[PDB]
Each structure stands twice: as C-alpha cells, then as structure tokens.
Amino acid sequence: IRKKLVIVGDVACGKTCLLIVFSKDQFPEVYVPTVFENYVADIEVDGKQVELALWDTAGQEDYDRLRPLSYPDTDVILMCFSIDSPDSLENIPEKWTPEVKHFCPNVPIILVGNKKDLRNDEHTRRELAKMKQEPVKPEEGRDMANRIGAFGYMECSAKTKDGVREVFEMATRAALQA
Ligand SMILES: Nc1nc2c(ncn2[C@@H]2O[C@H](COP(=O)(O)OP(=O)(O)OP(O)(O)=S)[C@@H](O)[C@H]2O)c(=O)[nH]1
Numbered sequence: 340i341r342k343k344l345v346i347v348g349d350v351a352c353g354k355t356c357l358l359i360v361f362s363k364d365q366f367p368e369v370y371v372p373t374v375f376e377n378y379v380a381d382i383e384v385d386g387k388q389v390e391l392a393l394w395d396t397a398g399q400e401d402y403d404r405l406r407p408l409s410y411p412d413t414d415v416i417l418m419c420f421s422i423d424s425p426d427s428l429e430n431i432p433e434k435w436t437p438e439v440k441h442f443c444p445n446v447p448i449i450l451v452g453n454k455k456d457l458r459n460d461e462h463t464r465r466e467l468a469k470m471k472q473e474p475v476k477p478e479e480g481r482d483m484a485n486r487i488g489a490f491g492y493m494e495c496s497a498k499t500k501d502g503v504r505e506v507f508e509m510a511t512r513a514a515l516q517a
C-alpha cells in the first residue's frame with residue numbers, strides 16, 4: 340500500500356535530519372537549507388506493508404510560494420518544532436497551522452517535538468536562561484497538539500534515534516485509517 344507524507348516546520352528545526360535518519364540510517368554531517376526533496380522508505384505496521392513518499396520542504400520565508408506545490412495529494416502531515424526553541428512552538432498556530440489547514444483540510448496532523456536530547460543539555464539551558472526561557476515541556480507540546488486538533492503528539496531525537504521509529508508508525512497508522 341502506497342502513502343504520501345509531507346513534513347513542515349520552522350528553519351533548522353530538524354525536519355531533514357529526521358527524514359534522512361529514518362530512511363538511510365545516517366545522520367547528515369553538513370546542514371544545508373532545503374529548497375525541496377523527495378525520499379522513499381518501507382514500513383510494516385499492524386501486518387500491513389506500506390511504501391512511503393517522504394516530501395521534504397523548506398522552512399524559509401523565501402520559499403513560501405513553492406512549498407504549496409507539494410501539498411496536492413498528501414495522506415498525512417508531520418508538523419514539527421524544536422525543543423530548544425520555544426518560539427518554533429509558538430509559530431505552530433501562527434504560521435503552519437493556517438497554511439496547512441487551508442491547502443490540506445481533512446488530513447491527519449502529527450505534532451512532533453524534535454531535538455529531545457537538548458532538553459537535558461547544559462549548554463542549551465544556559466543560553467536560554469539569558470532570554471529568561473527554558474526548553475519546551477512535554478505537557479505544553481501536548482496542549483498545543485490538542486488545541487489544533489492533532490491526531491497525536493510525539494517527541495524524539497534524530498541524533499540519538501530515541502523515538503524516531505514510533506513517529507513514523509503513528510504516521511502510517513493515521514494515513515491508513517481515518
Ligand atoms: N541536537 C540535535 N540536533 C539536531 C537534531 N536533528 C537535527 N539537528 C541539527 O539541527 C540543525 C538543523 O537540522 P535540519 O534537519 O537541517 O533542519 P530543518 O528543519 O530541515 O531546516 P530547513 O531545511 O527548513 S532550513 C542541524 O545542524 C542538525 O544537525 C536532533 O535530534 N538533535
């Protein structure tokens with residue numbers, strides 16, 4: 340069974356690394372902003388065999404016009420944000436929810452907190468202290484997921500691999516049913 344999925348979220352929130360890890364097992368060395376890209380990977384969930392189309396998108400403003408060209412026949416969407424950056428969570432209902440909600444209504448959305456490893460990182464906590472902030476708490480991410488009627492919230496780390504597999508299984512599970 341074939342299904343298509345699109346990933347979206349702020350700049351450098353880990354969109355790409357996540358998709359590459361899951362389908363190539365390697366963690367990209369050099370960070371290069373994405374214009375657009377396509378990937379494929381297979382997965383078995385609840386006995387079903389599913390081929391997956393992974394459409395990567397850009398989080399940059401400069402590309403707002405072309406990003407909507409990948410939305411056409413989407414089955415499920417992974418709306419991502421970063422745990423070290425509280426603002427990227429704020430921009431969920433601001434920019435991404437409206438954009439997606441327009442182009443792709445009636446399509447399941449999986450809210451995804453990324454860079455789960457940086458929640459404990461000391462360097463991270465110290466830099467955010469200047470800004471009188473702190474990493475995102477699992478609760479607030481779940482609240483945001485409910486607020487926008489997401490199919491489910493999930494967290495993970497593409498660096499350590501913590502929870503990466505569960506993210507896609509939930510996506511596939513949602514792309515089949517509903
Ligand atoms: N600590 C940590 N760093 C990560 C993780 N995933 C990605 N990164 C790092 O964060 C930076 C952003 O990664 P990337 O996936 O390219 O962002 P993006 O959201 O796709 O960004 P764009 O293409 O919209 S500009 C990179 O330097 C990458 O190595 C993660 O799980 N943990």
Ligand SMILES: [Mg+2]
Pocket residue numbers: 354355356371372373395396
């Ligand atoms: Mg990218």
